[PDB]
Amino acid sequence: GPKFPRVKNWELGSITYDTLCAQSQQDGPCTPRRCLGSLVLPPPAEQLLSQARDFINQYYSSIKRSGSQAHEERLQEVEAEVASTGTYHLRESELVFGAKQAWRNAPRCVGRIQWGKLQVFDARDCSSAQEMFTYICNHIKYATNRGNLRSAITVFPQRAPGRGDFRIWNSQLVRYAGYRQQDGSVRGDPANVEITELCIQHGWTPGNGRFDVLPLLLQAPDEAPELFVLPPELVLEVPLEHPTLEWFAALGLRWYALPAVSNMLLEIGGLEFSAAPFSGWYMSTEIGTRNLCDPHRYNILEDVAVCMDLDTRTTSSLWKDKAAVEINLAVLHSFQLAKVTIVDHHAATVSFMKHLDNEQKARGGCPADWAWIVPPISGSLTPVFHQEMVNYILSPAFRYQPDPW
Template sequence: MFRVSGDAPDSVFSGNASASQPTRRLRVVRPSSARSAPPVDMAEAEEFLRLFHAENRESGSLQQRLDRMRYEVDTIGTYRHSQQELTFGAQVAWRNSARCIGRLYWRSLKVRDLRDVHTASGVAAHCVQHLRMATNNGKIRPVISVFPPETPQRPAPRIWNEQLVRYAGYQRPDGTVLGDPRYVRFTEAVLSFGWQPPLRRTAFDALPLVVETVDEGPHMFALPPEVIEEVPVTHPELPWFAELGLRWHAVPVISHMRLNIGGVPYPAAPFNGWYMGTEIGARNFGDSDRYNLVPLVAERLGLDTSREDTLWRDRALVELNRAVLHSYQQAGVTITDHHTESKRFLTHLAKEEAAGRKCPVDWSWIVPPMSGSQTPVFHRYYDEDHQRPNFYIDEDATHRALNGGPPRFA
C-alpha cells in the first residue's frame, strides 16, 4: 500500500533477539563505495522550515530557526533537524509521495530517530526491530527508521536491499528460476560473498541484508527467521490452492529509497505501510517476469488457454488475488483491497484540497494493476506537481539491489 518504490508497483513475531544482537554477521563483502553529500541547498532548507512552522504554530520563532540553519550550513555545509522536524518531514514525505495510494494515513507514521546509529551491525539490528514493531501481531503499523544523513563530512549508512524482506532467485541450468527472478543477480552476488541458503532451497528463501558504512564497507546479515512473518496462501473455495505451497511476507518495508527533508538526504530510511492485495496477487505473483503464476492457476482451474479471447488470464488473476486477500485475513494480518483503498484515496484527496494543499499523483501508479476502470481513482485527472519533502528512487541503491554489485559511481 505504501507504494513509492521502484519495486513491483505495488510495499506476529516470536523470539527474543535484542536490538543489539538480532542478526548474524556473515562477512565483509567488498571495500566501501560510500560517498559524501554536497552542501545543503539553503533555499530548499528554508522552504522546509517555513512549511514546518506554518503547520506547527507552537514551534517557536521561525526567524531564529532560519538564522541557526543558515549558520550551520555556512559553517559545515548542512544542518541538523530537531526531533519534531524529522518526524514532520518524514510524515509529509509520505503525504507528498505521488505513487502511493495509502496516503490517507500519513499522520500515523511512526518515526524512529536513529541518526546516531553509524555501524553496520547497529543498522541491521534496528532493521530487525523495525520488522517486529511494524508487524505488531499482524495489525501492521506504518513505521520509518531514519538512520544518519549524508553530509559533506561523512557518507551515510546505506542498505543494498530493495526491501528488508525479499526472496532469493536461483538460476537453474535449464534457464528456469526457483524463487523470484527479479533477484537472481543479487542472489548470485550474495552467494559469492559467502551467504549460505537453506540446505533445501525453496521459492521463498529470505535474502540476507547487506548494509554498507564508510568505515566498515558492506556487510551481510542473516535476518532471524522469527522476525519474518509469512502468510501461507490458500483459497476460500479451492482446496488445491494450498498444494501450490505459496506464501508471502507480512510487511513490505521499502529500504532502497532516499528520504530528503529540507535538502538533507537520508539514504537509509526503511519504511512501510501494509500490503494492498494486488501488490502480491497481481504483481509479485502475477507478473510474467516475477513468479508468473497466472498460467499455472489457469491450468489448475481447467481454463482454455489456447486463445486469449477466453480471458483465461483475467479469470486466473482474480482467483489468485482472492486467495491472497483471503489468506491474509485468515492469518489476522492487515491487508486492503484495491477497491476499498481507491475510495479511501479519494477521501485523502478531498482532505488535502480542503486544507488548501496540492496532492501530487502519478496516475499510472495510483490506478490498481487489475480492474482499474472499476475503481474511482481511474476516472479523473490529478495534480502532477512535485512536492517536498519526498522520497526518491536511489538509482545506485537500485543497481546494487538488482545486481549485487557496487554502485555505478564506484
Template sequence: MVLQQGFTQDCCEEEGDSSDWDEPENELRTIRGDSTAVGFSNVHKGIRQSSWDVFVECSQAWRTGILFVIVPMFSNVLRLNSPAHMSRWEQVQKEVKATDTYHLTETELVFGAKLAWRNSVRCIGRIQWSKLQVFDCRYVTTTSGMFEALCNHIKYSTNKGNIRSAITVFPQRTDGKHDFKVWNPQLLSYAGYKNPDGSILGDPANVEFTEECIKLGWKPSRTQWDILPLVLSANGHDPDYFDLPQELVLQVPLTHPTFDWFEKLQLRWYALPAVSGMLFDCGGLEFTAAPFNGWYMITEIGCRNLCDVQRLNMLEPVALRMGLDTRTPFTLWKDKALVEVNYAVLHSFQSRNITIVDHHTASETFMKHYENELRLRNGCPADWVWIVPPLSGSVTPVFHQEMAHYQLKPSYNYQLFGHALSRRIKATVLYATETGKSEMYAKKLNEIFGHAFNSQVYCLDDYDISSIEHEALILVVTSTFGNGDPPENGEVFAQNLYALKMNDSSGLTNGHDKFSMASSKSFIKANSQTELACQHTERRLDRLESLRGSVSDVMSEDTFGPLSNVRFAVFALGSSAYPNFCAFGKYVDNLLGELGGERLLKLAQGDEMCGQEQAFRKWAPEVFRVACETFCLDDDDTFLEATIALKSPTLSASTVRFMETKAEPMDAGIIEFIIFLIPTSTFVKKINKKIIFKCVFLSSALSKCHNKKVSTCNVAGAFNLHGDNA
C-alpha cells in the same frame, strides 16, 4: 525544485520575481529568484519578508531545501514568525555558514518523514500519512547497530499481524564518501537462483542480488522461499550481510476458500512490505538509508508478485488447475485466474487476522484523501499509472480521476544505485553514424564498460564539448561518410575539437556556423599532415609508449594539452571500397592525441567490406581490459562478465524461428557432396554406426521458411561500382 508551502503574493511582488499570478488557485506557481526556480502552491499565508532575507543569506546549496521542513512545520503549528521560529532560523543559518550543512531536530525529522509520505505520488494509501512512526537512528555508526535497529523496526511494524507503518532513519549524507546504505530493495524478500538449464528457483526479480549475497559469503539453503539476508553499509565502509531470524519474519501460506488444490501449490508471501532502497530527501538533506513500510494491497501480491510473467508467473498453472482453456484468449482465462489468485491472497491474510486492504477500499480512501488535499493544499500530486490498481481498474474511482504529477519536497526518491555508480570511474562512449551501425556498436561497448565503469553513451551531436577536458575516459565509435566526410551528426563535434586544438575558445559553435573542416579534402589533408608530423616527433601519447619513456620525456611540454588527463580509444568504421578509408575516424583519433590525450590502444578500423564485426569483437574486450588495467580495476570475473556481452546469442525459440521438417532420402548427388566435404575414414565410420547425414538445398529451405518459391541462379558477372571503371 518544488516547495510545498511558500510565500504570499505580496512577498514575491516585493522581491520583483512573481509570475503568472492570474493562474487558477490549484495550479503550480513558479517564482524565479537568483538562478533557482521554486514552485509552490499558495497555501500558508503570512511569511514576512524578513524570513526570505534570512533564507537568502544562507548558502546557495541549502537555501531552498531548508524551507521544505522548517517553514511548513512552524506554519502547521501556527507559530510562523514567532520568536521560536526566528531563533531556529538564526541557528540554522549559523550552522550552514560554519559547516555548509545542518542537522534537523527530532521534531523536524518526524514532521519531514510524515510530509514525505504525504507527498509520495505513487502511494495509494497516503490517507494514513500522519500516523507514521519515526525511529530516529541517526546515532548509529556500525552495520551491527543498523541491523539491530532494523530488527526492532520489523518487530514493531509486524506487530503479530496488526501491521503498523514506520520508518527508521539512519545518519544523513555528508561528503558522499561516508554514506549509510541498505542495499536490499526491500527489508524482506525471497531469494532467486538461476539453474543450469536457465530456469529460476525462487523470485526471478532477486536473482542478481542473491548472487551478490552469495559473493559476500551468504550460505543459502537454495529453496523456493529463502529469505534474503540484510546487506548493510555504514559510514561508507564495505557492506556486511546479516541473516534475519526466522521468527522475525511473518509469512502467510496462501489458501483458497473454495479451491482445495490451491494449498497444494505451496505458495506463500511475507506480511510486511518494507521499502529500503529509497532516498529520504528532507530539508535539503539526503538520508540514503531510511527504510519504511505500510501494509499490502492485495493486487501487489496477487497480480504483481505472483502473476507477473517476470516474477513467479503463476497465472497459467492456476488457470490449468481451474480447468480453463488457455489456448485462446477468448475464454478470458487470464482474467478469471487473476481474480481467484487475488481472492486467495485476501482470504489467506484475513483468515489469520493480518492487515491487508483490497483495491476497491484503497481506491475509495484515496479519493477521500484526494478531496481533503484539494481543500487543504489546493492540490494533490499523484501518478495515475501507479495509483490505478492492476486489477479491475476501470471499476475503481481512481481510474476516472484526472491527476497532476508533480514533485513536492520532502520526498522519497529512487536511488537506483546511483551513488554506487558515482563512485565508479566515468566512461563516455561517443558515436557518429549515418546508417546506425556505429550507434549499435557504441551501445554494445557501453554495455561492456558498464560492468566496471559508470558508462554513458552519447551521439556526438548531443555531446557538450566543454565537458571533454573533464572526462576520464572517452571511447569514440564513428563511421566515415562518402569520400572521407564525417557523418552529419559528427560535423559540429569535429569543428569544436579543431577549435580546441587551435586554442580558439570562440571557435566553439552550436552548429549554426559553417564547418570550416567539413570537406573530405580537409580531413584527408589534416590526417596526412598529422601522420607526417608524428614521424618527426617523439611525443609519447600511447599508454605503453609513455611507460617506456624517461621522466624528462614524459614531463616535456609536448605531452601536455587540454586533454592531458583524458584517456581515449577510437574504433573507426568505413569501407575499403572508398579511397579515403576511415578518414574521419583517423582525424578524430589524431586530434585527440594532439590535444594531449593518452591513447589506450592504437586506432582500430572496421571494414564494411570484410570482417567489420570480427574487428569490433576483437577490439572491444581488448580496450576494456586495458582500461581496467589503466584505472586499476583488474578483476577477472568482471572481465569475464563483460566479454559475455559480445557473444552471439544462442539459437533458441526466443531468438530464431524453428520449423519442423521431414527427413528426406538423399540421392547420389548429395552423398557425393558429403563425401567431398568429409574425410573418407570419418564418413565410413559414421556410416557404420548408421548415422544418417541430411542435406537440404538452400533454395528449398528458404522456400519452406518464407512460404514462397525461391529459385537458384548463376551469377553472370560482378562489377565494382566504386572502381576506376565505374
C-alpha cells in the same frame, strides 16, 4: 477561469483546481512537446540553504508560528550551522514532520489516507552495520506487531560531506531469493537475481527454494557491507489458500506480511537520508497481481488456469482474467485468515478518493501518478480510474537512488 490545472472526475462530474502545484520547486520529465508520465524512472551551501529555509518555513507553518521569533531564530541557526560546517541538522520534531510530509507528498502511493499516522524511529545515532541491524529488527518487530501492522520508518544518519553513506543494499527488508538455474530459468523471485548473487558473493550460503527470505547487506560509512540473516521468528509470512478452490493450498505459495522499502532516499530540507527504510501494509494486488502474475515475476497465471481447467489456448476465454481474480481473492482470504493487515484494491482506492478530498481542502490539491494509483486489475471498477490527477514533485520527498554497487 482560475489559472491553475482544472481537474475533473468523470464519474461524478465534479471539478477542482490544483493550486498546490505552485509549491513545486523541482521539475519532472514532461514538456509541452511530449508527455513522459509513463516512465518508471525520471553541496552548494547556496542551494542547500534555500532548500533548508523552505523546509523550516514549512515546519513553522505546520505548527502555526510562521513569522514568529522562534521561526526566525531557527532560520538564523540553520544558516549559521551551514555557514560554519557546510550542512545542518534537524531537530527531532522537524525530522518527524519531514518524514510524514515525504509520505504525504509521494505521488505513487495510494495509501496516503494514513500519512498522519507514522511511527518515526530516530536512528541518527547509529554508528555501525551491526547497530543498523539492531534498529532494523526492532523496526520489523514494531511494524509487524503480530499481524496488526503499523506504519513506520527508521531514519539512519544523513549523508555527510567527506564520508561514505549509510546504505541498505536490499530493495526491501524482506524479499525472496532468485536463483539463476542451469537451463537459464529462475527458481524463486526473478526480480531478485542480482541481490541474491551479491549476497552469495558476500558469504551467504544460499538455499534452494521458491520462497527463501534473503539476508540483509548493510553498509555503514566507508566500510564494505556486512551480511545479516533475519531470525525466522521475526519474518511473518502468510501461506496462501483459496476460500473455495481446495487445491490452491497445494500450490505451496506464500508471501511475507511486511512491505518495507529500504533503498529509497529521504530528502528533507536539502538533507539526504540514504538509509531510511519505511513500511506499511500491503494492498492485495501488489501480491496477487504483480508479484505472483507478472510474466517476469513468479508468473503463475498459466499454472492456476490449468488447475481451474480453463482454455489457455485462446485469449478470448479470458483465462488470464479468471485466474488473476482467484489468485487475488486467495491473497485477501489468506491474510484475513491469518489475521494479518491487508487492504483490497477497492477499499484502498475508495480511501484514496477521501484523501484527495481532504487534501483539496488542506492544501489545494494532491500530487498523484494516475498510472500508479489505478490498480493493475479491475482498473475502471475502482473510483480513481475516473479521477483526473495532477503529478508534480514536492519536498520533503522519497527519491530513487543508484544501487550502491
